[PDB]
Amino acid sequence: ASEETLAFQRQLNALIGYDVTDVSNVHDDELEFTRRRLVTPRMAEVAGRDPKLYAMHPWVTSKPLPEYLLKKITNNCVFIVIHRSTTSQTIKVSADDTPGTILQSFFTKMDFVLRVCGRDEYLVGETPIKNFQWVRQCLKNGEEIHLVLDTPPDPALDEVRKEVSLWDCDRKFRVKIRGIDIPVLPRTADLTVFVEANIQYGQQVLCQRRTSPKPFTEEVLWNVWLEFSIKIKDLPKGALLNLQIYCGQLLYYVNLLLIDHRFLLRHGEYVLHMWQLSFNADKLTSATNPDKENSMSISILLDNYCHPIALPKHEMPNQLRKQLEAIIATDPLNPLTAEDKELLWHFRYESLKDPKAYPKLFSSVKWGQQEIVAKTYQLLAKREVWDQSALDVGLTMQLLDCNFSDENVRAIAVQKLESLEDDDVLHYLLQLVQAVKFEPYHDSALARFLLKRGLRNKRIGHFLFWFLRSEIAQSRHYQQRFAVILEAYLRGCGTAMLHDFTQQVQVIDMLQKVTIDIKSLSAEKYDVSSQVISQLKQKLENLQNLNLPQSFRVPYDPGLKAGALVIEKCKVMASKKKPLWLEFKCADPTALSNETIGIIFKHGDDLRQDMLILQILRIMESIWETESLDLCLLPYGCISTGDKIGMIEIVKDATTIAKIQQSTVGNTGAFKDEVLSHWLKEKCPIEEKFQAAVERFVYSCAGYCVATFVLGIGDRHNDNIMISETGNLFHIDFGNKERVPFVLTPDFLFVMGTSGKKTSLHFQKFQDVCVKAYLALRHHTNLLIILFSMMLMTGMPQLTSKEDIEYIRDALTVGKSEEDAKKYFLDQIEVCRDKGWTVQFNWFLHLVLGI
Numbered sequence: 001a002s003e004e005t006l007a008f009q010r011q012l013n014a015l016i017g018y019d020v021t022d023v024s025n026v027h028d029d030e031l032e033f034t035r036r037r038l039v040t041p042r043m044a045e046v047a048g049r050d051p052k053l054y055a056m057h058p059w060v061t062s063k064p065l066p067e068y069l070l071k072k073i074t075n076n077c078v079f080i081v082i083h084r085s086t087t088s089q090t091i092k093v094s095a096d097d098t099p100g101t102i103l104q105s106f107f108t109k110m111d112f113v114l115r116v117c118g119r120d121e122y123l124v125g126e127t128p129i130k131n132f133q134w135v136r137q138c139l140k141n142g143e144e145i146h147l148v149l150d151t152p153p154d155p156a157l158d159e160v161r162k163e164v165s166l167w168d169c170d171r172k173f174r175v176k177i178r179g180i181d182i183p184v185l186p187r188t189a190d191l192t193v194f195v196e197a198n199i200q201y202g203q204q205v206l207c208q209r210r211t212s213p214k215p216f217t218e219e220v221l222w223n224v225w226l227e228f229s230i231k232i233k234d235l236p237k238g239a240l241l242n243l244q245i246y247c248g249q250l251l252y253y254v255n256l257l258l259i260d261h262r263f264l265l266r267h268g269e270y271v272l273h274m275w276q277l278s279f280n281a282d283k284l285t286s287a288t289n290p291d292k293e294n295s296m297s298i299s300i301l302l303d304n305y306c307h308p309i310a311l312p313k314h315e316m317p318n319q320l321r322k323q324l325e326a327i328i329a330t331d332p333l334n335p336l337t338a339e340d341k342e343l344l345w346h347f348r349y350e351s352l353k354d355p356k357a358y359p360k361l362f363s364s365v366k367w368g369q370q371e372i373v374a375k376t377y378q379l380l381a382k383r384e385v386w387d388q389s390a391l392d393v394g395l396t397m398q399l400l401d402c403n404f405s406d407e408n409v410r411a412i413a414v415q416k417l418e419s420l421e422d423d424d425v426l427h428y429l430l431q432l433v434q435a436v437k438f439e440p441y442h443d444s445a446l447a448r449f450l451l452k453r454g455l456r457n458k459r460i461g462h463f464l465f466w467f468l469r470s471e472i473a474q475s476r477h478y479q480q481r482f483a484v485i486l487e488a489y490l491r492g493c494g495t496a497m498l499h500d501f502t503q504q505v506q507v508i509d510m511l512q513k514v515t516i517d518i519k520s521l522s523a524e525k526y527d528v529s530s531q532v533i534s535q536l537k538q539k540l541e542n543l544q545n546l547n548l549p550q551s552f553r554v555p556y557d558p559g560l561k562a563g564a565l566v567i568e569k570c571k572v573m574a575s576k577k578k579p580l581w582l583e584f585k586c587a588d589p590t591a592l593s594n595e596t597i598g599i600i601f602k603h604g605d606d607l608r609q610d611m612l613i614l615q616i617l618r619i620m621e622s623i624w625e626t627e628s629l630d631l632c633l634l635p636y637g638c639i640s641t642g643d644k645i646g647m648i649e650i651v652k653d654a655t656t657i658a659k660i661q662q663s664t665v666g667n668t669g670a671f672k673d674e675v676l677s678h679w680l681k682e683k684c685p686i687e688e689k690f691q692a693a694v695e696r697f698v699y700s701c702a703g704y705c706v707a708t709f710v711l712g713i714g715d716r717h718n719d720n721i722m723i724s725e726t727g728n729l730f731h732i733d734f735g736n737k738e739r740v741p742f743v744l745t746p747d748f749l750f751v752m753g754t755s756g757k758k759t760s761l762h763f764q765k766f767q768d769v770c771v772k773a774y775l776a777l778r779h780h781t782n783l784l785i786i787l788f789s790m791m792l793m794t795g796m797p798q799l800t801s802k803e804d805i806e807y808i809r810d811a812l813t814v815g816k817s818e819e820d821a822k823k824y825f826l827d828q829i830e831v832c833r834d835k836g837w838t839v840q841f842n843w844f845l846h847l848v849l850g851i
């Protein structure tokens with residue numbers, strides 16, 4: 001234990017934002033055990049990754065080129081402008097030649113490598129140029145691919161630092177509830193409370209027992225023994241002893257894994273500190289409440305016994321086969337009757353041939369029966385139909401949600417994920433990282449898969465860091481487990497990344513202190529005091545001096561390096577919440593422009609919800625890639641940094657729809673349908689440009705209508721919708737009456753050439769693109785269902801319900817034929833033109849006038 005070895009932990013601890021060594025809030029040593037067990041999976045990843053490729057994190061995709069990009073490449077060639085000094089050469093190149101044929105073919109025309117100008121994005125390795133996302137991005141963006149020739153980075157910068165019985169216990173299970181202790185009680189005194197003890201598994205309660213009600217006092221005793229109807233030998237690994245307390249309604253809960261990470265049956269005394277309620281993921285944690293001084297506690301007693309340990313295991317009637325498929329063919333949200341289940345089970349080996357049955361089949365399992373489980377494991381010993389199945393993210397996600405607590409059922413889904421290439425991991429990472437909250441133990445296959453894909457790739461690890469840190473900073477329920485996974489990662493990403501993260505962490509702490517210190521200059525009046533402006537430009541000075549790091553990677557776009565702050569352009573938005581608007585220079589001289597990097601840091605909205613939505617949006621964008629479509633969404637970058645703070649990308653050349661109305665019209669709701677188009681034109685003199693800023697609108701507007709309606713958030717005020725001086729429209733702020741499917745106001749239809757209720761050229765163009773994108777999603781109904789369902793379970797602070805999830809099922813018209821569907825959407829589009837500005841005017845009355 002040298003000083004060097006201690007300093008390291010200390011740094012990592014401040015990088016994580018929680019002390020992973022702490023042991024003040026543990027009733028066992030699972031965390032310590034898990035930090036120790038991750039040491040091996042990390043080393044294996046570090047030692048087996050190529051130093052260079054890892055050093056340059058090439059970004060690629062072995063997927064085909066969409067139909068909308070194919071058409072953008074004359075024959076099979078493309079141009080690439082290479083820059084040396086100020087020299088520049090344009091070259092037509094073999095669309096299929098490794099970045100190696102280039103260079104060599106360049107040397108023969110006019111120890112290096114190609115890099116995207118102004119960005120840390122290298123095109124290297126044995127991959128067809130066209131398979132590089134940067135290229136594909138430029139093509140669709142009709143932009144010139146500018147690459148500067150520079151020296152390859154030196155892997156040395158990624159240097160890693162120096163490193164007794166069995167089942168048989170035919171007895172039942174029981175627990176003693178001695179009492180509950182709370183140093184304080186509710187104002188609305190004179191209450192009654194009781195302890196409820198449930199033996200849970202996969203959100204399913206196998207058994208349950210209570211205690212008698214008593215008045216709610218600072219100390220309620222019982223010393224009552226509760227006997228459960230289940231046999232010790234029947235408790236499965238991952239089962240939770242869920243302890244709850246109701247008050248004459250749920251109010252406090254805590255949980256304890258009955259079988260620990262060593263396979264032992266928990267025993268002994270326990271004083272667990274409980275979480276209080278204000279249905280969702282937090283209710284499943286094995287973590288205890290750290291605030292011991294203010295948190296209700298529960299004193300319980302577990303049967304003192306020697307050492308009970310769990311042992312690690314070693315054609316049909318048509319008419320029936322038909323009803324079996326009727327069940328296997330039901331969306332994820334459909335229930336399962338007792339008959340449905342028994343049927344599914346009896347025909348295990350049959351149901352087993354179809355991968356889409358796994359979620360349903362493994363839920364008909366009676367996990368409270370040791371005998372049934374064993375067969376279940378036997379049933380999996382032979383996983384040929386699965387092993388050989390084609391990876392289905394949607395199906396695999398369903399096995400990782402809160403319905404399965406079994407280690408072997410989850411591991412098979414993780415097994416199918418090993419098959420994802422980096423470009424896909426990056427599409428499902430956020431949700432894969434949220435899924436860790438359903439793991440019953442801190443060490444898991446899914447937890448090791450995220451370590452492994454992180455250590456193995458810089459883009460993935462850059463994000464894994466932020467997705468976890470986001471949860472460690474504002475989740476007391478899961479900070480410990482996530483803190484252990486992030487430490488393990490920080491221990492193999494390299495000295496380089498370790499230094500970047502630090503630059504980022506500094507800039508963020510410093511800048512958020514400012515954000516809050518500025519909000520406190522007027523928490524109720526939308527008046528950017530002339531002094532409030534000088535006040536801000538002043539703190540940025542103090543910091544910008546010799547404190548704030550001169551530069552830093554942009555967390556939501558790692559391939560970008562921020563330079564200094566352009567204090568002049570910095571301001572405090574005229575928003576109730578007073579978000580900061582900051583501008584920075586790019587720190588890369590080779591950048592082919594002088595444009596700044598804009599970032600907004602804000603307090604008061606939950607940006608974890610925005611990350612969730614924004615990510616599902618990129619997922620939709622990729623779902624349309626397969627069906628060969630481009631809806632022009634613009635999921636700007638957004639990263640939750642702490643409680644109700646975080647950063648947001650500033651999309652250039654863009655404004656609020658409402659603001660557009662406000663200028664032409666004014667500070668009232670008499671909205672003029674022509675303002676928008678009169679805005680595009682003024683910002684796009686050149687016909688060819690304006691004529692192109694209209695097609696974008698049609699597509700962008702269409703896509704958000706669809707995406708926003710499928711997610712159930714299509715109804716919102718004008719202020720939450722934005723447009724770019726290139727016509728790209730895009731939603732924002734996702735933080736008894738009138739309603740609408742989405743936003744398709746009169747001004748929008750005006751841009752498309754339809755003053756009245758008469759179809760137009762662009763309108764039909766829009767109508768076709770809609771139904772098209774809409775139907776393209778249904779082709780993934782299940783994927784969207786389980787994604788929407790995971791989201792509500794880990795992204796919503798309030799307890800969500802089935803009724804909440806089901807919405808998505810209707811919006812996607814499950815069990816319906818494409819025909820009916822096409823219509824459903826077109827009808828929804830109709831309600832829009834039938835309410836014109838109705839809903840907006842109302843919103844303006846509610847949000848603006850406080851009515």
Ligand SMILES: O=c1c(O)c(-c2ccc(O)c(O)c2)oc2cc(O)cc(O)c12
Binds near residue numbers: 649650651653733734
């Ligand atoms: O690009 C912009 C952007 O991304 C956001 C944004 C994103 C998420 C939020 O939750 C939020 O409140 C605002 O606002 C803006 C506001 C302007 O006036 C101009 C802009 O260019 C943006």
